[PDB]
Amino acid sequence: KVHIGKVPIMLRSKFCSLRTLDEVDLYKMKECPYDMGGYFVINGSEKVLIA
Amino acid sequence: NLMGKRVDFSARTVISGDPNLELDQVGVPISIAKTLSYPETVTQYNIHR
Amino acid sequence: LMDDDPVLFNRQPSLHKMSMMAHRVKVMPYSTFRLNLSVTSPYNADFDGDEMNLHVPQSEETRAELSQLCAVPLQIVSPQSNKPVMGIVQDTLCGVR
Amino acid sequence: EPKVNIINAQDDEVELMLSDVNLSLANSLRRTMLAEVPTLAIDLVEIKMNTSVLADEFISHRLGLIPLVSEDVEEMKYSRDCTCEDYCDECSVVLELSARHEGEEGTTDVYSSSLIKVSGPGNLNVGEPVRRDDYDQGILLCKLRNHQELNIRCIAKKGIAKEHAKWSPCSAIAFEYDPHNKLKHTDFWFEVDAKKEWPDSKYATWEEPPKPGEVFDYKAKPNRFYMTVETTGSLKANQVFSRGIKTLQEKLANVLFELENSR
Amino acid sequence: GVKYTCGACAHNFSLNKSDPVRCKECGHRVIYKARTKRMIQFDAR
Amino acid sequence: MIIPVRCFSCGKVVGDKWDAYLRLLEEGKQEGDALDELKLKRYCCRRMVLTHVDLIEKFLRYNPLE
Amino acid sequence: IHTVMREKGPKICAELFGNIQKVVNYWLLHNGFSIGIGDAIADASTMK
Amino acid sequence: DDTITTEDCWTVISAFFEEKGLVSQQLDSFDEFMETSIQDLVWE
Amino acid sequence: AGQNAIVAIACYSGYNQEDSMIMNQSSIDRGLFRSLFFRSYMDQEKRFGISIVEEFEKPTRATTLRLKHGTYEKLDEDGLIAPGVRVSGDDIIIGKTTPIPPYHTKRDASTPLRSTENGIVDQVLLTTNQEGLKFVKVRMRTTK
RNA sequence: AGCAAUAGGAGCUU
Ligand SMILES: [Mg+2]
Ligand SMILES: [Zn+2]
Ligand SMILES: [Zn+2]
Ligand SMILES: [Zn+2]
């Protein structure tokens, strides 16, 4: 398994680590339940792709 | 840089309306009034002031 | 900067010579600029976000030039249509009616 | 010649009819009670440990907005006319608040009743936060979870509502006169008829409606004024009214003093 | 030296500028300084 | 965030009424009747209590970091 | 305004704005002027 | 059976938003990307 | 994201003309349209070589040059200000030094506060970046 | 007694 690179992950998508973790653990992970995702985190900055 | 350029001794802020000002009066904030300045040559009529 | 100093006051865009006029200073608190309401027509200004620029003349020749050529009272009548450009507006008109 | 007719009188509000006075007098009284009657309110907050979710100036604003008993505040001095340095005992009231949540379930509410008066110019009856009853819990100040703590030292001082609304003894001073528009001081907007489309004043039955045969009177001035003072519990309604009158009296006496001693 | 705190496990401790940045109890990666000791005044306005 | 102490417009103290308002709402009473019993008669005071959104409950759910 | 400008000069014409503004603003402060939803409503016959 | 009212329409719309939310296009696009697009680009 | 204000539509005193608007000072005093503001400054240490790196530290005048015109008297011994401290404009909140390549051999790279803003320090964070060098985030707070 | 540049993007008032 050759490592070919790292792909940024869209928050609240099926590959995000927040997709599971119903509200209690979301609160424990410092994540707002109202936050809907749909963006990326690059160097700690939230980025959204404009259609 | 030649037809137009940036200049010193200028200010900018939001404008407001004042029914109690005269037509040729402008109300200047205190902070801007202290930041901006006018050079006044000292003479024998304005030395005390 | 002190009371009655002539300063050039200006709003962009400066479409005609009466968009930039010389005003007498009155020092006030509360960081906005204050304008008599009849001069908002030549500037095409209103009070919903607008900002205007103030230029301070640094010599006596420029003070005299401002006060004797660019002063607000001297621009009431315009050469564009040989009619006044400053009038009574926007509540004084309704109230005087 | 001035006359008062109280219509309703409880501790928090008094409803009264004022008569045989000029409208300027009645309006000056309304303004004085709204703006220039001194009270006591927290004017300086000292945070020791605040680990609650609320911010420090949020809590400070809320504490400053807490009504305190101000019955004896008139025998007290303004903190700008005292020789003392950092607050003494005679021109300030010092309060303490200590709150803490222990356990890992539930939320502990921090109420204004938890404020504790420590010092103050005794035995003056000032300083205590106002409670409605014996069983009142007071005002909500903050909420606390596990291990969160609030440690605050508040100072209370004398001030008026001109400087800041937290010193206002009054909430709303209802005020009206001439329910039937006999003086024609208003000119009713209408679509079809101005009499059908406008609700009656709550003091309409206190005055005779104009007769259809009546002509307009150009001698009548306003003479009866119906006003309802309400308080926040810091002062009582009769106290608010009487001290508004006294404050107005002392303002006029100050003017008279300056005039006489300007000769 | 100066007091710090973990961001994950809320542990209190104090580090002295030469050890790495870490928690004792858990070993977590992010730490926050502690509130100052001075006294802070607010105007309640 | 948390119930304001005073009414913005007139200054009546409403900060001591939020819990009573919630208790009135549990037994089924509609908002106008609850506001009537708390003796909020002016619509400024009424909209003070009627439009409050209590966000401190949401802010308190994130574990204290001390 | 044009007449006063032409006869009296720019200073008197400038002061005219202030005089009229102050008088009318005081009168309107103590008279009042508003607008409401009812000022845009015509009666039934006009609607017909 | 009775006439569908406006409130019935808002119930239907609440069902729609309960399912999809407000950013479902972003999430579904990215899920499609990571499920199929990367592998297809590798096999192009 | 708003508040239900009580609004009158009137030509009251002439100060609401041309989209101006009169607001009650007492309602402002009781908290109408009052808001918190949070500004966060960031800074980290870079590696210019083998043993040449930056350091978070209060820069003493003797060993450092080109020091900013603000005050440094608020930094602790670690070059970081503490949360809970009042800060004015031009004040330093993160002290940092960059070594002079080949006493008195250091220049400063400190981050001052913005010349316009007042406020109170809220949350001084400290961690390490992707490459293991020290990393600092400082969140300020104020009320508008 | 000394506070970089170049770009892109989003905005303010006409
Ligand atoms: Mg505009
Ligand atoms: Zn004293
Ligand atoms: Zn830890
Ligand atoms: Zn109210």
Tokens of I7: 């609004």
I91/C84 Cα distance (integer angstroms): 53
E24/C46 Cα distance (integer angstroms): 62
C20/C26 Cα distance (integer angstroms): 18
**After which residues does chain E have a break in its backbone, defined as C to next N over 2.5 Å?**
none
Enumerate residues 18 to 77 of chain I having a beta carbon within 8 A of any beta carbon in chain C.
Answer: 18-20
Rounded, the Å distance between the CA of B26 and C1' of J7 is 39
Nucleotide nearest B14, from its CA to each C1': J13
Among candidates I93, I54, I97, I55, which has minimal Cα distance to I76? I93
∠ CA G24-G26-G31, rounded to 5°: 90
Q: Are F10 and F44 in contact (CB under 8 A)?
A: yes
Among candidates D247, H33, I134, G10, which has minimal Cα distance to A8? H33
Among candidates I124, E35, E42, which has minimal Cα distance to D47? E42
Which residue ranges of D make up the annotated binding site for Zn(2+)? 79, 82, 84, 88, 90-91
Interface B–I counts its CB contacts (< 8 A) at 11
Nucleic acid strand J: bases within 7 A of protein CB: 2-3, 12-14
Same domain, D170 and D250: yes
Rounded, the Å distance between the CA of I66 and C1' of J2 is 7
Number of structural domains chain D divides into:
2
CB–CB contact C40 I14 (8 Å): no
Q: Count how many residues are written for chain G.
A: 48
Enumerate residues 14 to 43 of chain G having a beta carbon within 8 A of any beta carbon in chain I.
Answer: 21, 25, 28-29, 32-36
Resolution (A): 3.8
Same domain, D113 and D214: no
Among candidates I87, D55, D47, I59, which has minimal Cα distance to E37? D47
For residue B7, the SS3 value is coil
Is residue I19 annotated as a catalytic residue, yes or no?
yes
I3/F52 Cα distance (integer angstroms): 10
The answer, yes or no, to whether the previous bond of D123 is cis (omega within 30 of 0) is yes
Domain holding D239, by residue range, is 1-38+166-263
Shortest CA distance from G27: residue in chain I: I13
Same domain, D196 and D230: yes
Among candidates B23, G8, G1, B16, which has minimal Cα distance to C87? G1
Q: Which of D165, D192, D221 is the last residue of a domain?
A: D165
- Contact status of B29 with chain I (Cβ, < 8 Å): no
Q: Are D58 and D140 in contact (CB under 8 A)?
A: no
The answer, yes or no, to whether the previous bond of I99 is cis (omega within 30 of 0) is no
Specify the experimental method.
cryo-EM
Same domain, D44 and D148: yes
E33/E38 Cα distance (integer angstroms): 15
Q: Long-range contacts of range F54-60, CB-CB < 8 Å, 24 or more positions apart?
A: F54/F1, F54/F2, F54/F3, F54/F18, F55/F1, F55/F2, F56/D53, F56/D54, F56/D143, F56/F1, F56/F2, F57/D143, F59/D53, F59/D54, F59/F1, F60/D53, F60/D107, F60/D143, F60/D145
What type of residue sits at position F11? G
B/C touch flag: 3 or more CB pairs below 8 Å: yes
C76/G12 Cα distance (integer angstroms): 11
Q: Which of D165, D190, D212 is the last residue of a domain?
A: D165
Q: Which of D143, D165, D187 is the last residue of a domain?
A: D165
- Contact status of B16 with chain I (Cβ, < 8 Å): yes
Q: Are C22 and C7 in contact (CB under 8 A)?
A: yes
Same domain, D154 and D176: no
Helices (H), chain D: 23-35, 56-64, 237-260
Q: What is the Cβ-side half-sphere exposure of residue I38, based on CA atoms within 13 angstroms?
A: 8
D243/D45 Cα distance (integer angstroms): 28
Same domain, D142 and D177: no
All residues of chain G having their beta carbon less than 8 Å from the beta carbon of residue D198 are none
- Distance from the alpha carbon of residue D41 to the mean position of ligand 2, in angstroms: 16
Among candidates D72, D63, D66, which has minimal Cα distance to D126? D72
3-state secondary structure chain C: CCCCCEEEEECCCCCCHHHEEEEEEEEECCCCEEECHHHHHHHCCCCCCCEEEEECCCCHHHHHHHHHHHEHHHHCECCCCCCECCCCCCCHHHHHC
Please enumerate in sequence order all residues whose Cβ is within 8 A of that of D44, keeping only pairs 6 or more positions apart, or say none: D87, D154, D155, D157, E41, E42, E43, E44
D218/D210 Cα distance (integer angstroms): 14
D141/D109 Cα distance (integer angstroms): 8
Q: Strand pairing partners for D68?
A: D129
C11/C51 Cα distance (integer angstroms): 7
Enumerate residues 4 to 43 of chain G having a beta carbon within 8 A of any beta carbon in chain C.
Answer: 5-6, 10-11, 13-14, 17-18, 20-21, 24-25, 27-28, 31, 33
CB–CB contact I18 C94 (8 Å): no
Task: Centre a 10 Å sphere on the Cβ of residue G22 and count the other Cβ atoms it contains.
Answer: 14
Å between G26 CA and nearest CA of chain C: 9
Same domain, D184 and D114: no
∠ CA I5-I6-I8, rounded to 5°: 130
Q: Could you give the dihedral angle defined by the CA atoms of residues D230, D231, D232 and D235, in that order, rounded to the nearest 10 degrees?
A: -170
Please give the helix or strand (H or E) that residue H25 lies within, else none.
helix H24-32
Q: Which of B11, B26, B30 sits opposite C29 (nearest CB)?
A: B30
E31/D81 Cα distance (integer angstroms): 48
Same domain, D115 and D203: no
Please give the helix or strand (H or E) that residue H31 lies within, else none.
helix H24-32
Strand J lies under 7 A from the Cβ of residue C50: yes
Same domain, D96 and D4: no
Among candidates E31, F23, E8, F64, which has minimal Cα distance to D100? F64
Q: Are F16 and D138 in contact (CB under 8 A)?
A: yes
CA distances from D148 to C67, D49, H25 (A): 65, 9, 41
I21/C32 Cα distance (integer angstroms): 14
- Distance from the alpha carbon of residue F42 to the mean position of ligand 4, in angstroms: 6
Tokens of D129: 């936060």
